[PDB]
């Protein structure tokens, strides 16, 4: 019945900042808390253990601290390694729980996606399957939504995004958005139509092709 | 009344692994040496492991030894079956079976046994990726840049690498965190961005090796 409250969920910050993440507690935890760094497709690495103590190894440039239901994790002087998620935990004998993470990228301005649409190749239509895919580029911040329309009914459960990690010079983000459809199904239809949802765009950007043309 | 029920099974690729659990009702497993058996599709039953009371004692037939491990939870009632490395000849129903008889000795037959829970070992441990274009047209033209790329489809295991133009073309790229799909084949896209005044200028060829198959696939993405 702890539960762990963890602000902000992103945090945009710039090389040699100084940044500061909050953990809350539902209840009195006295010290018992943890933080951990993730790197994407990685293991979680524990970095401080009862609020303050840092593990072996760990640069002195992080630090904890807080008791009872409010606990601070301050990174002081963001290196190119520190962009990461950080988790905190509360940790008991028996169980544990987990705040939501803090994402910690590299800020920039708001970039719109620039979207593109791609028709299945005729090579693989040939073998029965119709790829679709809908390419959104270079734009920030990382939240998007796309939506497939194929004659304007809204698809749902057939496609499958993919993002990158934050771009090295330009801090952007890319994404991919794949519908894929039996070439049957593919052939029912006229009108393919990606529509593009992002703080940038003003109103969403919807690219479209008709089948055959 | 005694009961016995496998679960885990379906489909692994070849050098894969799978784990088998065994629950049972109506009696506890502390008692008894506990067994995996396995049916193959010729229709003969072969023995695969083991347990004996306390895990004392594991035992295990010689085409699976070192790569199959038995275990079991007396607390919990259940028997777990590890496989790794997995062979197409592992193709078989498995079994739980008790080793018992209504007055328990020193060797007894085995007179209870779960329904069988079905374990396909396919031949192929990888599989190359199909490669087709994504082709430049003025759907993919946004202000005076156009994208185009390869999808790289239904390879595994992972990874694929991705160049274009055998490495002399790298600004613009972005190639894509694969996706498992539902097929359990894997997918991705490549894609570059070029302004819309290079394309007729030049070609664009992506370079993907997967190395786990050993296939290398050039393609070439027009117009
Ligand atoms: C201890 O008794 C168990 O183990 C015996 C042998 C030693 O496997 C077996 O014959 C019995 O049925 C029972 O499973
Ligand atoms: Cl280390
Ligand atoms: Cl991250
Ligand atoms: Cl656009
Ligand atoms: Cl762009
Ligand atoms: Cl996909
Ligand atoms: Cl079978
Ligand atoms: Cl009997
Ligand atoms: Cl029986
Ligand atoms: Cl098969
Ligand atoms: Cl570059
Ligand atoms: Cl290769």
């Known amino acids: 019945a702890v539960v762990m409250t963890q602000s902000p969920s992103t945090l945009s910050a710039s090389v040699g900042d100084t940044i500061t993440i909050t953990c809350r507690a539902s209840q009195s935890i006295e010290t018992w808390l943890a933080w951990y760094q993730q790197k994407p497709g990685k293991a979680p690495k524990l970095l401080i253990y009862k609020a303050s103590t840092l593990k072996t190894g760990v640069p002195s440039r992080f630090s904890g601290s807080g008791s009872g239901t409010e606990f601070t994790l301050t990174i002081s002087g963001l290196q190119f390694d520190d962009f990461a998620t950080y988790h905190c935990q509360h940790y008991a004998g028996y169980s544990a729980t987990f705040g939501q993470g803090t994402r910690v990228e590299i800020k920039r301005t708001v970039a719109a996606p620039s979207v593109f649409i791609f028709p299945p190749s005729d090579e693989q239509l040939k073998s029965g399957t119709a790829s679709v895919v809908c390419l959104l580029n270079n734009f920030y911040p990382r939240e998007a939504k796309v939506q497939w329309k194929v004659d304007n009914a809204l698809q749902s459960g057939n496609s499958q995004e993919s993002v990158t990690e934050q771009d090295s010079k330009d801090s952007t983000y890319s994404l991919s958005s794949t519908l894929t459809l039996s070439k049957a199904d593919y052939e029912k239809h006229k009108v393919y139509a990606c529509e593009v949802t992002h703080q940038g765009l003003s109103s969403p950007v919807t690219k479209s092709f008709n089948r055959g043309e | 009344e005694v009961q016995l029920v496998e679960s885990g099974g379906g489909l692994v690729k070849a050098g894969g692994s799978l784990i088998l659990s065994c629950g049972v009702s109506?009696?506890?497993?502390?008692?008894?040496?506990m067994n995996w058996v396995r049916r193959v599709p010729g229709g003969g039953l072969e023995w695969v492991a083991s347990?004996?009371?306390?895990?004392?004692?594991?035992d295990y037939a010689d085409a699976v030894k070192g790569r199959f491990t038995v275990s079991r939870d007396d607390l919990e009632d259940f028997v777990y079956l590890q496989m790794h490395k997995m062979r197409v000849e592992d193709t078989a129903i498995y079994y739980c079976?008790?080793?018992?008889?209504?007055?328990?000795?020193?060797?007894?037959?085995?007179?209870?046994w779960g329904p069988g829970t079905v374990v396909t070992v396919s031949p192929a441990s990888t599989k190359g990726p199909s490669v087709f274009p994504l082709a430049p047209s003025s759907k993919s033209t946004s202000g005076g840049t156009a994208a185009l790329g390869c999808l790289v489809k239904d390879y595994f295991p992972e990874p694929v690498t991705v160049s274009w133009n055998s490495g002399a073309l790298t600004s613009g790229v972005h190639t894509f965190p694969a996706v498992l799909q539902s097929s359990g084949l894997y997918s991705l896209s490549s894609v570059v961005t070029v302004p819309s005044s290079s394309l007729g200028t030049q070609t664009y060829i992506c370079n993907v090796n997967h190395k786990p198959s050993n296939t290398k696939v050039d393609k070439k993405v027009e117009p």
């Open positions: 347990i004996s009371t306390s895990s004392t004692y594991r």
């Open positions: 079976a008790r080793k018992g008889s209504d007055r328990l000795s020193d060797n007894d037959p085995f007179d209870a």
């Open positions: 109506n009696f506890r497993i502390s008692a008894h040496t």
